[PDB]
């Protein structure tokens, strides 16, 4: 839904590349998020001490968390927009426990795109970028709707 089936197939085709190396993509994505938008580490007390990209790359905790994040995102993307049941617990924790504003979800979406462009430049063209961007945008829109239901000013 929202995306055409053909657009979803571009998304899942790019996502298969992510699934070939989930921990590597998750490390890169979190490091890119924290390096570009260091204010986002205010949400991760446990990672505030990491002093360099090298230390971040060597952190097993950070790696495991990237796996957690991308595993959850892959399950969402594979539902192709019919992701109500996967999004419910995620919106709950991120609105009420972690308190993640929508703008931080935009930042991590931009980091996902950047990392895919860095890791797959010869197999991540304009249509694949546009489709992944639409899919992440839909994810954010539906999170925002749940945020509102929950009373959280995202
Ligand atoms: C693609 C977007 C995201 C996905 C799919 C995702 C997914 C997850 C999942 C599955 C968990 C573990 C279970 C839970 O608490 O719900 C988690 C934990 C958490 N997430 Fe997210 N997340 C995303 C974005 C973010 C962003 C952008 C931030 C902060 C800027 C953030 C902050 C946190 C924190 C603080 C935790 C707890 C970490 C800990 O255990 O120490 N999340 N996330």
Swiss-Prot record:
This is Myoglobin. InterPro entries: Globin, Globin-like_sf, Myoglobin. Belongs to the globin family. It is an enzyme of class 1 (oxidoreductase). Monomeric. O2 binds at residue 65. It is found in: Cytoplasm, Sarcoplasm. The keyword Glycoprotein does not apply. The modification Phosphoserine is found at residue 4. PROSITE patterns: GLOBIN. Heme b binds at residue 94. Nitrite binds at residue 65. Residues 2-148 form the Globin domain. The modification Phosphothreonine is found at residue 68. Monomeric heme protein which primary function is to store oxygen and facilitate its diffusion within muscle tissues. Reversibly binds oxygen through a pentacoordinated heme iron and enables its timely and efficient release as needed during periods of heightened demand. Depending on the oxidative conditions of tissues and cells, and in addition to its ability to bind oxygen, it also has a nitrite reductase activity whereby it regulates the production of bioactive nitric oxide. Keywords: Cytoplasm, Heme, Iron, Metal-binding, Muscle protein, Oxidoreductase, Oxygen transport, Phosphoprotein, Transport. Its EC number is 1.7.-.-, 1.11.1.-. Pfam families: Globin. GO terms for biological process: removal of superoxide radicals. Its main location: cytoplasm. One of its GO terms (cellular component) is extracellular exosome. It comes from the Eukaryota. It catalyses: Fe(III)-heme b-[protein] + nitric oxide + H2O = Fe(II)-heme b-[protein] + nitrite + 2 H(+); H2O2 + AH2 = A + 2 H2O. One of its GO terms (molecular function) is metal ion binding.
């Amino acid at each position: 839904m929202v995306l055409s089936e053909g657009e979803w197939q571009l998304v899942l085709h790019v996502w298969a590349k992510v699934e070939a190396d989930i921990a590597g993509h998750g490390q890169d994505i979190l490091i890119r998020l924290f390096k570009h938008h260091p204010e986002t580490l205010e949400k991760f007390d446990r990672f505030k001490h990491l002093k360099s990209e090298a230390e971040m790359k060597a952190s097993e905790d950070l790696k495991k968390h990237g796996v957690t994040v991308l595993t959850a995102l892959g399950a969402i993307l594979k539902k192709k927009g019919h992701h109500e049941a996967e999004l419910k617990p995620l919106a709950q924790s991120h609105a009420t426990k972690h308190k993640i504003p929508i703008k931080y979800l935009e930042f991590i979406s931009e980091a996902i795109i950047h990392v895919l462009h860095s890791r797959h430049p010869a197999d991540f063209g304009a249509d694949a970028q546009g489709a992944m961007s639409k899919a992440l945008e839909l994810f954010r829109k539906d999170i925002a709707a749940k945020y509102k239901e929950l009373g959280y000013q995202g």
